[PDB]
Amino acid sequence: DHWPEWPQHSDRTRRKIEEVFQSNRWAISGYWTGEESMERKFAKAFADFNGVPYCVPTTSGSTALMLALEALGIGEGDEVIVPSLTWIATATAVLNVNALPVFVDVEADTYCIDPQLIKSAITDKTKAIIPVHLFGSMANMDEINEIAQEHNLFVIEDCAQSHGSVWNNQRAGTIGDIGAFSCQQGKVLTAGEGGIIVTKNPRLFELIQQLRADSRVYCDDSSELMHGDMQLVKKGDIQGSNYCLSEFQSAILLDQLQELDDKNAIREKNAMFLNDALSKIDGIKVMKRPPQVSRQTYYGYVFRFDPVKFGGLNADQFCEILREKLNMGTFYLHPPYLPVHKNPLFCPWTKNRYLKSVRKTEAYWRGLHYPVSERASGQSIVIHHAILLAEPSHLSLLVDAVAELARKFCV
Amino acid sequence: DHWPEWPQHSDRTRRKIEEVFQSNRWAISGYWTGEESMERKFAKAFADFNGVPYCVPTTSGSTALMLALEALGIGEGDEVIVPSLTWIATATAVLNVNALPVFVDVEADTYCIDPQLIKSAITDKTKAIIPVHLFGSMANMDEINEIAQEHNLFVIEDCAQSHGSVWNNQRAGTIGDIGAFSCQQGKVLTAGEGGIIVTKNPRLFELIQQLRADSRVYCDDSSELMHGDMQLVKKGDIQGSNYCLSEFQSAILLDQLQELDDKNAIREKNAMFLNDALSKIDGIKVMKRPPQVSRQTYYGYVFRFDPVKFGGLNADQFCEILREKLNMGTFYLHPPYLPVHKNPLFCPWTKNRYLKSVRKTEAYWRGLHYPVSERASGQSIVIHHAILLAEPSHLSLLVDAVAELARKFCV
Ligand SMILES: *Cc1c(COP(=O)(O)O)cnc(C)c1O
Ligand SMILES: *Cc1c(COP(=O)(O)O)cnc(C)c1O
């Protein structure tokens, strides 16, 4: 018996792959072979799951974010507000469309973009905001939508770490103008690599299709197609490139989606258990869950600690101790990563592909200051969601480990 | 008995997929699970196949072209020469890096970029050329390399339609500074979606890795990795995004690569047979194969006809007749598509993501004039490579069909 690992599959996953082989259609750009593509089947299923009208699968979360921006007409001379604490893609997607990402610090108890700091970052160039529902929390969409409405700004939800979360009875991604998701191996819904884009607007739906299929859209009626006909047809309303997801991946996502809500329920149940237990340890502070959140998807379970009460340990050392005591990998228990502006992987100034005006210089980005997002990697622990799938008796070990470590520093 | 179809797979393909499931590592960004990734295994195999030092798999042919340009430092203010007759990606990849694609017509008997027209298109802004080995021919690399050397220009080979072709004992893609390939469903080496980048330069190799893995590169030594360790590590010499190929696709490509050279040999053998037979029909002109080509990979078999000798038929009508007589789908027998500048899918002016200076206007592109590439779609027939895998007796039917049609217009 060991800790739950990730990814996870079953014979159902295998059968979906076999279905792709049987259809002999490996791409949506391939021709019709008799029945609907895995892409459309997944898109329809995910649309119902999110209670959103339109869904367009794509290649990755990074590309989903990029196309979302393109669909909204964002480009050179524009500014896009994003949180400092998130994966660098949230910011590089902006640079990819020739726009300038503008960082805003996150809230101390949610690690999501601080609404009260967004207003000060708005300029005449600001065109949109990309809130990120980080780890196991949601950005305050009540506040964000209010700011967006008042300042005429678009909203793109980066839901790569929150498939299925619910804010005021709306699934994450359906709240903003366009929702973007990642299906990379570590995420709760994955096919190794993959992306998803959702929107409520019909026009954006057509634009997004074209943006990912070299300016093409689905034919008028797929029920009329005969074996050998193309399902994608020319449109040309907006220039796109090839960002189509392979049928093999759409098939795996279809399979994984079948158990997504239930597994999320299990993770959430265990997360609350941890909140109850861990919150009773002096010096330990769990994240603050807003009343508006009725369902929280935990891509990562996060809890913070007071170094003053824990022998001055940094998150790295804290995690090392826990991992040795619980015998779990670094991939499953570790501190949050560095904020984007300080992250070595974020280095815009290194390539000519980026406009000189937006890539700036190393000093410009590295010199930015966002206290909360910066201190996060030094005093908080992240538990990968796979662990949240373990039996309660096993999770207790984690709580005991933290308790033991606390008793050691208790004077 | 019917015509060969595409894609094609066997139990070997299935076993590779099963290996991915067994490893439980679905992405190269996932952690090490004991043995080498499918990505590295494929990269190594393809490198040996191409006799090229470095190979980096990616998401698509379009993205492969784009990253190749980024790796070479191409950006705003630059011009890149590309042929007018090719898939639009060859040109949109340039626009994707903020550079301006500059069209040059193709040769009447090869449909590949005319070397003698490139010189006139060179300006002080020109930084590179992207020759395309279109359908079943190769661009004249002797001439192109000479021009590139004299004008200090980089060369990127678009090999999406020529996996395995050989010019003067060098596989297509290994000749220029960087080679780009597509593994989309219709290509000779496919996994539904997929891309490949190859290069002889060590520095470019590192840059390309970072460009497709969020600024990361492979660890120093994979033999030291333990189960749970990450194989990708930070580098930060150049800004990249996530363009990693899923393990499922690398596995299928590994399988398909096993029989690529032999199937290409079969296609080539049949292509020559068609050249011999069809060339004996008055009004039919096969493509001209250069002496430098020792191995020609036929993604598409092309032959042209003289409308004057064929009742004034256009390629569309010619193909319709053949398809009805041979009973084969539109996907397998059809005329070449429109040149990029006239292609409805090519519409740069429609999105703000592109610099105003490079997207120009509809009239600017649509108003371009490239005679040869334009007449191609009206008087030539393209046979998909799958058909070139049929038994010789079956191909004879195609020759007979063309002969019958010719006898009908013979006065
Ligand atoms: C994983 C992730 C991404 C990017 O998705 P990819 O599939 O890796 O391209 C973007 N934003 C967040 C918050 C993510 O967690
Ligand atoms: C197919 C193709 C591409 C693009 O590859 P994708 O995998 O479709 O992105 C580019 N150039 C040529 C010549 C192609 O045939």
From Swiss-Prot, chains A, B:
Enzyme class per UniProt: transferase
EC number: 2.6.1.100, 2.6.1.101
Involved pathway(s): Metabolic intermediate biosynthesis; 2-deoxystreptamine biosynthesis; 2-deoxystreptamine from D-glucose 6-phosphate: step 2/4; Metabolic intermediate biosynthesis; 2-deoxystreptamine biosynthesis; 2-deoxystreptamine from D-glucose 6-phosphate: step 4/4; Antibiotic biosynthesis; butirosin biosynthesis
InterPro entries with a match to the protein in the record: DegT/StrS_aminotransferase, PyrdxlP-dep_Trfase, PyrdxlP-dep_Trfase_major, PyrdxlP-dep_Trfase_small
Keyword field contains Transcription regulation: no
Keyword Cell membrane: no
GO molecular function annotations of the record: pyridoxal phosphate binding; transaminase activity
Cofactor(s) for this UniProt protein: pyridoxal 5'-phosphate
Alphabetic keyword roster: Aminotransferase, Antibiotic biosynthesis, Pyridoxal phosphate, Transferase
CDD domains listed in its UniProt record: AHBA_syn (cd00616)
Positions where N6-(pyridoxal phosphate)lysine occurs in the chain: K187
Catalytic reactions on record: 2-deoxy-L-scyllo-inosose + L-glutamine = 2-deoxy-scyllo-inosamine + 2-oxoglutaramate; 3-amino-2,3-dideoxy-scyllo-inosose + L-glutamine = 2-deoxystreptamine + 2-oxoglutaramate
UniProt-listed GO biological process terms: antibiotic biosynthetic process; polysaccharide biosynthetic process
Family label: Belongs to the DegT/DnrJ/EryC1 family. L-glutamine:2-deoxy-scyllo-inosose/scyllo-inosose aminotransferase subfamily.
Purpose: Catalyzes the PLP-dependent transamination of 2-deoxy-scyllo-inosose (2-DOI) to form 2-deoxy-scyllo-inosamine (2-DOIA) using L-glutamine as the amino donor. Also catalyzes the transamination of 3-amino-2,3-dideoxy-scyllo-inosose (keto-2-DOIA) into 2-deoxystreptamine (2-DOS).
Protein name, UniProt field: L-glutamine:2-deoxy-scyllo-inosose aminotransferase
Organism, as annotated: Niallia circulans
